[PDB]
Design a protein around this ligand. Sequence first.
Ligand SMILES: OC[C@H]1O[C@@](CO)(O[C@H]2O[C@H](CO)[C@@H](O)[C@H](O)[C@H]2O[C@H]2O[C@H](CO)[C@@H](O)[C@H](O)[C@H]2O[C@H]2O[C@H](CO)[C@@H](O)[C@H](O)[C@H]2O)[C@@H](O)[C@@H]1O
Ligand SMILES: OC[C@H]1O[C@@](CO)(O[C@H]2O[C@H](CO)[C@@H](O)[C@H](O)[C@H]2O[C@H]2O[C@H](CO)[C@@H](O)[C@H](O)[C@H]2O[C@H]2O[C@H](CO)[C@@H](O)[C@H](O)[C@H]2O)[C@@H](O)[C@@H]1O
Ligand SMILES: O=c1ccn([C@@H]2O[C@H](COP(=O)(O)OP(=O)(O)O)[C@@H](O)[C@H]2O)c(=O)[nH]1
Ligand SMILES: O=c1ccn([C@@H]2O[C@H](COP(=O)(O)OP(=O)(O)O)[C@@H](O)[C@H]2O)c(=O)[nH]1
Lengths: 343, 341
Amino acid sequence: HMRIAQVAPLWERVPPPAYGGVELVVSLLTEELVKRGHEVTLFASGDSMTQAKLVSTYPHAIRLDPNVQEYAVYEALQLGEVFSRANEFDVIHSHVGYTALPYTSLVKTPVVHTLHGRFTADNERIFSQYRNQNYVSISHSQRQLRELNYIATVYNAIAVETHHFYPQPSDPPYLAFLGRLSPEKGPHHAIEIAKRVGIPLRMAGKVDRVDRDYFKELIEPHIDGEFIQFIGEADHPTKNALLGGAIAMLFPITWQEPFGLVMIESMAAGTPVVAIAKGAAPEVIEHGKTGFLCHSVEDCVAAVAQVPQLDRMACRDYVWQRFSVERMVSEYEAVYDTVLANT
Amino acid sequence: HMRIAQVAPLWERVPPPAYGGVELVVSLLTEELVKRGHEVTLFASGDSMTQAKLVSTYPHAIRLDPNVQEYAVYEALQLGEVFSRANEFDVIHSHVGYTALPYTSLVKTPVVHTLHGRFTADNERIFSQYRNQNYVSISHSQRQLRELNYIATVYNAIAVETHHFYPQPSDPPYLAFLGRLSPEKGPHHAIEIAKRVGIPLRMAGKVDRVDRDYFKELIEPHIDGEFIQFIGEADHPTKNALLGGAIAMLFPITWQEPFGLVMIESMAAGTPVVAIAKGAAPEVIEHGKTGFLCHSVEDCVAAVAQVPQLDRMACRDYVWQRFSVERMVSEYEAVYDTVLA
Ligand SMILES: OC[C@H]1O[C@@](CO)(O[C@H]2O[C@H](CO)[C@@H](O)[C@H](O)[C@H]2O[C@H]2O[C@H](CO)[C@@H](O)[C@H](O)[C@H]2O[C@H]2O[C@H](CO)[C@@H](O)[C@H](O)[C@H]2O)[C@@H](O)[C@@H]1O
Ligand SMILES: OC[C@H]1O[C@@](CO)(O[C@H]2O[C@H](CO)[C@@H](O)[C@H](O)[C@H]2O[C@H]2O[C@H](CO)[C@@H](O)[C@H](O)[C@H]2O[C@H]2O[C@H](CO)[C@@H](O)[C@H](O)[C@H]2O)[C@@H](O)[C@@H]1O
Ligand SMILES: O=c1ccn([C@@H]2O[C@H](COP(=O)(O)OP(=O)(O)O)[C@@H](O)[C@H]2O)c(=O)[nH]1
Ligand SMILES: O=c1ccn([C@@H]2O[C@H](COP(=O)(O)OP(=O)(O)O)[C@@H](O)[C@H]2O)c(=O)[nH]1
């Protein structure tokens, strides 16, 4: 019974064929919001696929589009389209970060900001000046600016039914890395863990413009093609066979992870996660059940020997209980009611 | 009789100590408007030097600041500052490009956009949706979108009096390159021109992040230290001694130049410019009088033999005639009167 605007980043298609975290959450939230009888307008790339109304300022995803050199041009276009149509919505749900804060004070329509990212020394200055705005975090450890007006915590979710469940891992063992080849994800840790335990590592993910040197210096020289394998950017079927076949997924972040969708994607396939207890990993993994929280590489190596002790169906059942779209969208519906009443 | 907001980019100090084109133009325009009794508010870095009211969202210039990795935070910060107080000005004069267009439709106060940059395959799309807004070009050749509502063309200007005049170049001749070490300025062309004529080249400019590969593999291996010299970003006194001592300044652009402040800075020093005729070079150089418009490297080499044929004092007077702060500011004042009615 609401008019809702979903403003997505333009780097990826809202249902992204391969890499894409924020866009994927926007997809799940938007489709379920439409099923619940709301009039939803989605602001996203032109190739996006939604049953809501799609208003786009570019036909394709920006990251892998070769004709685009200035992402900010189309980012500003869609920001101008949204807030200049502010009277056609009851609430604006923005997912594009701080670039929407200076527009929010200029329109009557209340705006909800879902924080999808780490806090940095720079962005804290702009969030501080707009402290009295409606923010929603995706984990508790993310709230490093305890002066912002946090309306609620809404954990992210995946579509568990669309992930195939694997009862037992592949017959010759192998570990899995899934994610962008970034130091923040620590694929260098994953490679070192693999031959310390003697178990091969299969990796999937993109190597985008900012990590080419890092991949070039620390990741590429270790890729055998046999013990260390790199398939590159994987689509949904590819990553599901990647995670499902592994005894465990290595998540050795060196970073203040806000959430980590690949963790709940690994558990949905029935594969537990060996992660480092940074960021939101303690809130996502139940230690000694759906994975192991570790505080060093040697802890991760010691934990890999204890991953067959886990019940794999409990991993999938865990994802159903906490990270389903049903719960997430219902929690976002509770946010919209709060913002539209406590104005 | 106006309250005017000057919105500057944050990469450089509004009076930039060294590199900085757009920021320098905002400085001259802002100070002169304050002299003429306009109540000016300048939005810029905190170390800027102005007689207007200064509102800053970061204390220093970001480009050489090592603590900043996200320029967009402070750019968005000051954009929010302007339009949250947009009700306090009669005219907003933006110099920050397309990032301010979506704000213009949200406020009553009219906004004038001075275009400081080339048109691109991407940025044309955002200017197109905001075609009916108040734009000002800094050259006519820059108007590659003949559908925009250009209020006027206002050529840029420098403070000619602050540039020392050189009657005669340095005793052993040398040519000069001044500008960012970018392929858009073609310093590789300048080096090739340099030993084609028998005259050494002293070069000045910044080498920023996007051109390090260009500099490392195309420029740096040729820096002799004797025939080719690179002084590495010059401040105002050094760069003017660089131009004044040269027989001519090489301006070998490969690019749709919006203006080119180093040209009128070179002529102000009394040094004529041998440039290639792309972008605004025909409108800035008077061919055969204060320099030579060329269409190849070939031509630039031929022009170096005919630069003593030019009168150096006429070059300084030329900048006084066309690119003075007095003329530019009055035309921008006519734009403000135009936009306010
Ligand atoms: O300066 C902060 C610091 O953190 C990064 C990522 O480590 O910034 C990310 O966080 C916010 C919002 O998530 C945005 O400012 C950035 O866009 C985002 O990083 C994206 O850009 C880098 C490349 O610079 C990519 O590798 C990441 O994959 C991007 O992550 C987000 O963007 C995509 C597309 O929207 C989403 O699918 C993804 O879920 C997001 O996490 C760094 O930029 C920076 O070092
Ligand atoms: O796709 C556009 C293409 O062209 C550049 C210039 O090479 O873009 C410039 O034009 C607009 C507005 O001027 C902006 O997109 C850019 O900010 C501007 O280029 C600046 O950034 C590059 C680094 O990529 C620098 O070398 C230039 O020095 C910058 O040029 C302007 O910015 C400074 C400070 O704001 C001014 O002092 C200067 O006078 C301006 O020319 C490319 O950036 C882009 O790739
Ligand atoms: O090769 C890849 C690498 C990543 N992803 C997906 O992109 C999303 C990344 O979200 P995450 O939070 O885990 O990483 P981040 O956004 O922080 O870079 C996840 O849904 C991944 O399944 C993918 O499909 N293929
Ligand atoms: O070492 C340098 C190199 C450049 N500049 C100044 O930076 C400005 C650049 O303006 P221009 O239009 O010529 O180049 P662009 O802005 O287009 O890159 C000029 O005023 C130069 O005098 C400088 O002070 N020192």
